[PDB]
Curated annotation (Swiss-Prot):
Keywords: Chitin-binding, Disulfide bond, Lectin, Mitogen, Repeat
Native species: Phytolacca americana
Primary role: N-acetyl-D-glucosamine binding lectin. Shows no hemagglutinating activity towards rabbit erythrocytes and weak activity towards trypsin-treated erythrocytes. Has mitogenic activity towards human peripheral blood lymphocytes (HPBL).
Name of the protein described by the UniProt record: Lectin-D2
Residue ranges constituting the Chitin-binding type-1 domain according to the UniProt record: 1-42, 43-82
Amino acid sequence: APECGERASGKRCPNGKCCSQWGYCGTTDNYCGQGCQSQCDYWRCGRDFGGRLCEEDMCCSKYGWCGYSDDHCEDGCQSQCD
Ligand SMILES: CC(=O)N[C@@H]1[C@@H](O)[C@H](O[C@@H]2O[C@H](CO)[C@@H](O[C@@H]3O[C@H](CO)[C@@H](O)[C@H](O)[C@H]3NC(C)=O)[C@H](O)[C@H]2NC(C)=O)[C@@H](CO)O[C@H]1O
């Protein structure tokens, strides 16, 4: 049964996860993409997003995306770079 969204009385997902248009929590494009009901910016971080820190100990790249690659953790990384 739905764990978030309108069929869950506006309930939000834990750890900032995206609530899909179908009412479930997750982090792939099916959850965070078009139709996403809430917390759709799970993968964004840094200066352009209220200085939010990434979950899962991910680095916040200079472009404001969360990840583990050298591109997200090296050169311009905003937080949790190591
Ligand atoms: C304005 C512009 O195009 N700027 C470029 C930056 O966007 C780009 O950073 C990378 O952007 C892509 C999306 O366009 C990021 O992919 C996302 O990564 C998350 C999790 O890491 C994943 O859930 C998304 O599905 C995925 N989207 C796609 C479309 O694959 C990618 O992580 C960003 N990389 C970094 C290091 O922040 C940078 C680097 O290529 O270049 C700018 O010109």
